[PDB]
């Protein structure tokens, strides 16, 4: 009834007992040393420890420590020192490993939540996920895991209750074992489903505003769109948004259109205005639409794919907004290759530069009309360079999402490695719970129990190979 009882499997000659022992010591010491190195690197790098997105690492390594050191300690008090273990110390030894596994699963759970918030709700990530909140969540998860592991030590064994208990694990009631297996299994299944959903949704959503989803060329697409709108070929301007006063300057655009209608250039200019709002501005837009044959107004609901096609067909996009906090319209237009004539206010200033669009003073219809005339004059020459610059600038803003998806993929890899390592052991434990066993199952369980140490070995390798920040910190410490 000793922890890590090696008395079984007398097949091997005592000659290789020393080899097995030295291999076990080397593996345990290597795991402990690399876990300590990872923890030191994390703690001594101020950039790394202040990022919640990496906090899971600081948890996992600690868990990898808890399951490693104890093992080495649990190997010292049996072979080199023959000190027999009582019930309480054996329960503590098993509780350490169970707490380590539960902490690993909980760290993966918290990391999955953080990844979902970071990838699919970016606009909230810097506010919902703060460092104190992440620290509190990780501490709560660790305390929950510790309590679950300590429960048998507080009176949930098969001696105090006087009930039938497991064979592979003495002094441990089967009901507690079944409860722990069920908890970890349902948590792992939910984490797997969450990671699959996150990865699939990120794949289908992030790579949407791209030119690869359209067929043909720019000129033929624009000609077909204008034919569908019953207009001749010309320099096309597009406005999409809200019909209101104060947020988006659709009134400014209408005044600029009225000003430009008195010139001779208005004959070689097409306008599309898309949106819904107050009846007054919609009526003004419809009056302009019926007055001029090169102006089109759409108030209905447009599908995402139709807007994507529109962005990849028109020449310029006008964004005369008074208050634009994010400028996602500009981001989509520049991703799909459309030169933006946007107001220089809010979040449009840092997205658009003087070589990747035109910037306009907010709330000045005359200045907007002058900028539109400048864009029309610029359209006389080639414009492919501006489209390429806009695409490059727009893709420059999508790097963070790609890094987040890479971190999510790394987490999925860590999760699948954990599943492979801890699979057969949990299967044998369930077979223990459901029914009886033979000596062969006990032997294979004792042989497969080293997969936990292999997992603790390979986790730092994954962390070092995947994340560039940890490598940079490690080289900085050297």
């Amino acid at each position: 009834e000793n922890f890590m009882d090696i008395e079984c499997f007398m097949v091997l000659n005592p000659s290789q007992q020393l080899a097995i022992a030295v291999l076990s010591l080397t593996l345990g010491t290597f795991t402990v040393l690399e876990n300590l190195l990872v923890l030191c690197v994390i703690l001594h790098s101020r950039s790394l420890r202040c990022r919640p997105s990496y906090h899971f690492i600081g948890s996992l390594a600690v868990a990898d420590l808890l399951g490693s050191v104890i093992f080495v300690y649990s190997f010292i008090d049996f072979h080199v020192f023959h000190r027999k273990d009582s019930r309480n110390v054996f329960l503590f030894k098993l509780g350490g490993v169970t707490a380590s596994f539960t902490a690993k699963v909980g760290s993966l759970f918290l990391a999955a939540i953080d990844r979902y918030i970071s990838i699919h709700r970016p606009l909230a990530y810097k506010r919902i996920v703060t460092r104190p909140k992440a620290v509190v969540a990780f501490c709560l998860m660790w305390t929950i895991a510790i309590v679950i592991a300590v429960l048998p030590l507080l009176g949930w064994n098969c001696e105090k209750l006087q009930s039938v208990c497991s064979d592979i694990f003495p002094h441990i009631d089967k009901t507690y074992l079944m409860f722990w297996i069920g908890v970890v299994s349902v948590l792992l299944l939910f984490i797997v489903y969450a990671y699959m959903y996150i990865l699939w949704k990120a794949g289908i959503d992030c790579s949407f505003w791209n030119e690869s989803y359209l067929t043909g060329s720019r000129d033929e697409r624009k000609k077909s769109l204008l034919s569908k709108f019953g207009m001749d070929e010309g320099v096309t301007f597009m406005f999409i948004g809200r019909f209101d006063r104060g947020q988006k300057g659709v009134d400014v655009l209408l005044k600029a259109i009225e000003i430009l209608s008195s010139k001779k250039e208005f004959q070689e200019m097409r306008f599309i205005i898309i949106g819904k709002g107050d009846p007054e501005l919609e009526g003004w837009a419809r009056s302009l639409e019926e007055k001029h044959g090169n102006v089109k107004v759409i108030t209905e609901m447009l599908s995402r794919e139709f807007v994507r096609e529109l962005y990849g067909s028109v020449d310029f996009v006008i964004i005369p907004s008074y208050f634009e906090p994010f400028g996602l319209v500009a981001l989509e237009a520049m991703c799909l290759g459309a030169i933006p004539i946007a107001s220089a206010v809010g979040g449009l200033r840092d997205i658009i530069t003087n070589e990747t669009g035109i910037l306009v003073k907010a709330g000045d219809p005359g200045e907007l009309a002058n900028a539109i005339l400048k864009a029309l004059e610029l359209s006389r020459s080639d414009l492919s360079k501006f489209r390429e610059n806009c695409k490059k600038r727009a893709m420059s803003f999508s790097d963070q999402a790609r890094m987040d998806i890479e971190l999510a993929k790394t987490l999925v890899l860590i999760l699948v490695v954990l599943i492979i390592c801890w699979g057969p052991l949990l299967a044998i434990m369930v077979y223990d719970v459901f029914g009886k066993m033979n000596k062969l199952i006990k032997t294979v369980f004792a042989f497969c129990s080293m997969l936990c140490l292999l997992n603790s070995t390979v986790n730092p390798i994954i962390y070092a190979l995947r994340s560039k920040d940890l490598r940079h910190a490690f080289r900085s410490m050297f």
Partner: nanobody
Amino acid sequence: VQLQESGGGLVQAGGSLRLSCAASGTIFGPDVMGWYRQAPGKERELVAGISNGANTYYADSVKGRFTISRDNAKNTVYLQMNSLKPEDTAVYYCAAEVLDYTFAYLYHAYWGQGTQVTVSS
């Protein structure tokens, strides 16, 4: 979501007030917050807007006088005005915009009950 408004009331000309608006959302609540004003016999007008930090917007009639701030601990917005004028008497509304990232054209707007502000000389 739901928005609770407070701080309206009568005041002497040239005074100073601060209204507060608290949102109750699922995840971060609103992404953009704003204060609108409606004078009697007049159209509703946006008086202030904010997203986070120094991303605020102010109407030309309150530039330099009003100040909008946001607290993420309680997810609430404050609007503090100094040197009030009789022209500033109106009903103030709190607006909250939750906008999508995968489609810039999609958004949802929520409004408050509105509170009266009367500057009297």
